[PDB]
Amino acid sequence: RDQELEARLVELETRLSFQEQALTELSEALADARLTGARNAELIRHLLEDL
Amino acid sequence: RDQELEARLVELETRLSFQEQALTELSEALADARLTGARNAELIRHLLEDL
Amino acid sequence: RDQELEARLVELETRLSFQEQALTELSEALADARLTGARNAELIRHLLEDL
């Protein structure tokens, strides 16, 4: 009758699944942001020079 | 006497809670960073043009 | 014979460990990205002024 433990496992599994998905999305978005940062930095270095 | 399992559940629950909180904070900070990137890109596109 | 529960715990522990590691790496990378954003913004503010 100790199925309290299994219900909790099911809850943690579910939470963990959402976390995993969130993480993947945050990694993708950050990879893109970092590339934009890198590009911007390089554009700026140039503008600085042409002045 | 197999309460070893429940202690472990409690540990994972706790770990998961900190992860969730961390994720939320990282999402907020990234959303802000991305907007700054977007703004910067647009400012730069202009400077490039006015030169 | 209900060792099904322990195997699941072991799986969640393992998943959680990878998540934790991923999070740490994403936090580091974001901290760096944000600093680059901050720098870029300030470089740009200046260029805007010198024009």
Swiss-Prot record, chains A, B, C:
It comes from the Bacteria. Transmembrane segments: none annotated. Belongs to the SlyX family. This is Protein SlyX homolog. The lineage of its organism: Bacteria, Pseudomonadati, Pseudomonadota, Gammaproteobacteria, Lysobacterales. The gene is slyX.
